[PDB]
Amino acid sequence: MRVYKPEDVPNVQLADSTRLVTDEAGLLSNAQEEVMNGRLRAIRSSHAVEFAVVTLPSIGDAPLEDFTLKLARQWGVGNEKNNNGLLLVLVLDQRRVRFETGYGLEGYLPDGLLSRIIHDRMIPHFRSGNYAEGLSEGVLAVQQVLDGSLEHHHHHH
């Protein structure tokens, strides 16, 4: 159990803009991460959306929803409601995940929808102990929402 804060997470969206995946919890693996990289990168191109996935061992007593916002803002992807940007953070000691949308995804992915996706895919796996399966299908769920709506490479500004 190691406590993590926003500036304890490696700022991948400061350099790794083609990966977007961040495993600190040690729950994912190179294969799972690389397959997820292709998914996030596909969205990063097709829908132009900055979708970053992060996993942490523990946040301790830190507020999960506020945590995601703080991390997204410093990375830019959520800096006072960024257009096509979305953050995802998993916390092992809490067994919970939380999404963070800026403003450009409000016409696609509402917070409530993202909250439901947690119950639809993440929870059933976390109950079985499948953290990797929960994350992967949680990401795929968000992906398919966009993939089904934006039939063509769509750029906002």
- CATH number, domain with residue 56: 3.10.310.50
Rounded to an integer, what is the distance from CA 81 to the centroid of its chain? 15
Residues 146/47, Cβ–Cβ less than 8 Å: yes
CA distance 58 to 51: 22
Phi, psi of 86 (to 5 degrees): -150, 130
Residue of 75, 79, 81, 122 lying closest to 98 (CA atoms): 122
Residue 156, classed as helix, strand or coil, is: coil
Residues 83/119, Cβ–Cβ less than 8 Å: no
CA distance 38 to 89: 18
CA distance 51 to 141: 13
- Residue 135's contacts (CB-CB under 8 Å, 6 or more residues apart) are 27, 28, 32, 36, 53, 55, 88, 90, 97, 122
Phi, psi of 19 (to 5 degrees): -100, -60
Residue of 143, 73, 134 lying closest to 113 (CA atoms): 143
Residues 53/22, Cβ–Cβ less than 8 Å: yes
Task: Pinpoint the alpha helices (H) of the chain.
Answer: 30-46, 64-75, 111-117, 123-128, 131-149
On the 0-12 / 13-18 / 19+ scale of CB atoms within 10 A, 117 is: buried
- Read off the tokens for 107: 């016409």
Domain span at 58 = 1-157
- Residue 134's contacts (CB-CB under 8 Å, 6 or more residues apart) are 97, 121, 122, 123, 124, 125, 126
Residues 76/13, Cβ–Cβ less than 8 Å: yes
CA distance 115 to 65: 11
Per the structure, the count of domains in the chain is 1
CA distance 100 to 97: 10
- Residue 64's contacts (CB-CB under 8 Å, 6 or more residues apart) are 89, 91, 94, 96, 98
Task: Give the N- to C-terminal CA distance of the chain in Å, as an integer.
Answer: 42
Structure-solving method: NMR
Residues 54/88, Cβ–Cβ less than 8 Å: yes
CA-only gyration radius of the chain, Å: 14
CA distance 136 to 155: 25
Beta bridge partners of 16: none
